[PDB]
């Protein structure tokens, strides 16, 4: 039992960490070109999605 519970805990932890890293990298990729340029007329869908 303890083995399966710790395995499930590790699975959810690595899943959450991977999702967080992926959304952060997507934010980097889709934001850094606009942060280096003036007047970032950004459709706010990406930011509103990935700020939280």
């Amino acid at each position: 039992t303890v083995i399966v519970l710790c395995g499930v805990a590790l699975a959810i932890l690595v899943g959450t960490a991977s999702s967080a890293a992926c959304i952060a990298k997507a934010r980097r990729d889709c934001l850094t070109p606009y942060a280096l340029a003036p007047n970032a007329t950004v459709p706010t869908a990406l930011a509103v999605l990935c700020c939280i």
Binding site: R28, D29, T32, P33, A35, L36, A37, P38, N39, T41
Partner: protein, 153 residues
């Protein structure tokens, strides 16, 4: 150019030229070293690897004295510390042999004292030298333009 383009010092040599535009400092990632200015040494550099750059916010005092961005780039001659650069067919080129290592980060200047591109490297194609640079776009996109065979200075 001379007033507001700070080289990057390291081991007694200048390795690049960090530039402040639009109230933000940029410094190419491929080059390593320390900035001469004491103000710029205290800024947090957020790194963009895909464009080979890192950028940070300039302090309150130095925001007003910065070079101006641009979007419109008609083909022709453009200013540069080493002379003039030809822009044609969506490509930057210079006479063969001009420039070299340690000149990375040097901004290309417009007639009205406005920055058009930042020098990252140069590829020698025999007759001229094609400049691997980063340019702006009409929709505010920093396109990293690199001709084949580009080598980072």
């Amino acid at each position: 150019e001379s007033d507001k383009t700070f080289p990057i010092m390291l081991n007694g040599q200048v390795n690049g030229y960090a530039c402040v535009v639009g109230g933000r400092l940029m410094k190419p990632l491929h080059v390593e070293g320390k900035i001469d200015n004491e103000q710029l040494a205290a800024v947090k550099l957020k790194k963009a690897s895909m464009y080979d750059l890192e950028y940070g916010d300039v302090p309150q005092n130095m925001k007003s004295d910065t070079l101006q961005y641009t979007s419109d780039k008609p083909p022709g001659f453009y200013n540069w510390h080493h002379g003039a650069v030809q822009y044609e067919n969506g490509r930057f080129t210079v006479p063969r042999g001009v420039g070299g290592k340690g000149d990375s980060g040097r901004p290309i200047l417009d007639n009205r004292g406005r920055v058009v591109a930042i020098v990252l490297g140069g590829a020698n194609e025999g007759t001229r030298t094609a400049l691997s640079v980063v340019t702006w776009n009409q929709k505010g996109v920093t396109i990293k333009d690199t001709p084949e065979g580009s080598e980072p200075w």
